[PDB]
Ligand SMILES: NC(=O)C1=CN([C@@H]2O[C@H](COP(=O)(O)OP(=O)(O)OC[C@H]3O[C@@H](n4cnc5c(N)ncnc54)[C@H](OP(=O)(O)O)[C@@H]3O)[C@@H](O)[C@H]2O)C=CC1
């Protein structure tokens with residue numbers, strides 16, 4: 043809907059989510075942003091919420107995280123799919139199975155693809171770097 | 178050290194939040210052990226059936242008093258949240274304590290390896306004797322941060338998969354470093370969380386998961402989730418995993434001794450208060466508690482209705498709120514003007530939000546028809562429980578300044594109103610048990626320029642004295658002054674209400690209160 | 695109920711220019727600023743001051759030499 047989109051280039055999404063959820067917040071926060079945008083995401087969590095951190099900037103820098111957010115039942119996760127590729131093979135099958143089920147059930151739909159030829163690989167790298175791509 | 182407001186949930190200002198678990202016979206006599214958010218340390222507890230377990234025949238009501246909280250929190254921390262699996266490695270701080278013992282008992286049943294930290298040598302020996310599977314290499318020191326080296330060394334530098342932490346800030350930071358890849362940190366303490374101490378996020382470069390485990394959430398919501406933990410604990414009981422901890426019994430009269438002994442900190446297991454001795458019978462038809470002698474306090478039935486005359490005044494609203502904290506649920510406030518002020522509307526809306534059936538009468542008490550109407554409309558909500566007369570109109574001045582009309586006006590609400598309330602209550606209020614009339618110090622003690630006020634208050638006192646002689650209820654209270662809302666400092670409202678409770682409990686017909694300059 | 699006092703404030707923004715601009719005068723010569731408190735967003739905006747994430751922790755509210 044029109045009430046489900048926010049702005050990712052500033053911390054305005056915090057007020058949007060807090061208002062449209064009635065001040066309760068959300069349950070899952072699949073966070074990929076960093077620095078202050080990460081702290082704002084934490085404030086959106088509701089009791090028994092779960093924070094999934096897939097961005098490795100604040101994790102690498104070891105930036106502090108106030109633990110007061112854990113008084114509310116909250117589970118702060120660290121998600122790194124790298125482990126499964128070179129480690130955790132038994133766990134890989136559980137993730138692999140849900141992907142096969144999604145493929146056969148129609149949930150998994152391919153994303154839009156901007157194809158570059160092999161000889162123009164560096165052009166693909168530049169196009170990715172600009173960040174204008176969608177998909 | 179812990180403020181009562183820190184306990185989640187809606188709690189009355191005057192109440193006790195001591196005790197979370199108990200064991201005793203149900204209304205049908207069936208032995209049961211329960212878990213309550215608070216007020217569990219009493220001769221009776223009002224609880225929902227979803228928080229009760231049936232005590233096994235081979236257990237004792239003394240032993241079952243310790244199972245609920247520790248085992249429920251251990252199961253919630255490990256199985257529901259941490260999702261412990263057989264063969265893993267754990268670090269369970271403060272093994273001697275109840276939660277530590279429960280967590281160890283759960284872990285060993287699965288088949289994991291356990292590292293536990295114990296403060297002293299006697300606790301280490303006790304744990305070694307209680308859990309034979311546990312090994313001397315499973316122990317460490319909790320008061321010092323030397324367990325980090327021990328856990329890292331014995332685990333070969335990998336760390337412990339699952340951590341159950343209840344230690345202070347520096348011990349918490351030490352514990353985090355023990356986590357292995359895909360580790361899981363279960364935090365059950367509060368000090369670090371409440372203080373908002375920072376946590377370096379670099380630990381999440383591994384797949385570590387940080388859990389904030391509070392069990393108070395189940396009592397407030399998520400009952401559908403709570404039944405999972407209930408089933409887990411019942412399965413543990415029937416399978417043999419759940420064992421009742423060691424208990425030290427302090428009789429009911431020695432509760433303070435139990436508190437002191439637990440505070441000292443040398444206890445192992447759980448400390449229990451034997452409120453009542455178990456009967457030999459398995460199921461008893463009448464499980465009524467034995468009569469106990471306790472300090473008297475004032476509470477009101479919900480089905481009864483309570484009336485206040487001039488209840489919208491400065492003291493009226495505070496008295497009404499004090500009553501509601503005692504559970505009135507049906508209130509009638511009389512005032513000729515009606516709701517004319519913002520504060521009155523704010524308080525009335527606040528009360529009506531809670532469900533109270535507040536009512537505004539605007540029906541005089543001076544007129545006998547008015548008293549009858551006020552009593553009748555309060556009877557519709559429910560049987561009249563009590564009537565309080567806090568209606569005053571004051572006309573100050575020396576005797577030469579006073580005229581008969583001023584005396585009539587001053588005496589009309591307190592003098593005539595009291596007479597009409599008395600007449601109507603004796604005619605058609607058999608269930609009434611409170612009849613309070615707020616007199617003043619100026620009457621009796623004496624004051625300048627308030628002859629009419631003294632006359633009215635003295636007449637009210639005479640009426641209240643006459644009512645008691647007949648066996649009916651009647652109380653007259655004399656206040657020096659009220660500060661928050663004759664040589665005496667104004668009295669703060671909290672002290673005023675405490676004194677009012679004390680006076681309500683006592684048998685004397687007329688009482689007074691004031692603060693000397 | 696009770697006596698709650700501030701313990702933590704996530705962020706406070708103060709801008710004297712917008713404060714001078716926001717102020718307006720009443721019938722009296724006294725000057726006032728309109729305030730708004732939003733408990734959903736945990737923000738308190740008044741004049742040219744903006745307080746968000748105020749945390750208040752229960753004080754003991756115990757005083758000695760209470761009236762006897
Ligand atoms: N979800 C929640 O909010 C819940 C939280 N908890 C928390 O669990 C923690 C452990 O409780 P539990 O083990 O049953 O407590 P016990 O009092 O039964 O045991 C305390 C243990 O920790 C040490 N300890 C704790 N407090 C003191 C003290 N004041 N003086 C000396 N030693 C002390 C003791 O010595 P040592 O460690 O040195 O051997 C002992 O091992 C508590 O902090 C409690 O708040 C419990 C249940 C619910």
Ligand SMILES: NC(=O)C1=CN([C@@H]2O[C@H](COP(=O)(O)OP(=O)(O)OC[C@H]3O[C@@H](n4cnc5c(N)ncnc54)[C@H](OP(=O)(O)O)[C@@H]3O)[C@@H](O)[C@H]2O)C=CC1
Pocket residue numbers: 486487488489490491492493511512513514515540541542543566567568569570589590591594615616617618634656657658659
């Ligand atoms: N400092 C103090 O106030 C002291 C208190 N007291 C006692 O405390 C009691 C209450 O004092 P307080 O509430 O502060 O004083 P108020 O001046 O507020 O009492 C008058 C109140 O009663 C209402 N009232 C007047 N006539 C009637 C009537 N016939 N029926 C119903 N309501 C009526 C008035 O509203 P309206 O005018 O619209 O009818 C007003 O709300 C009095 O009985 C007084 O003797 C005594 C000593 C010290």
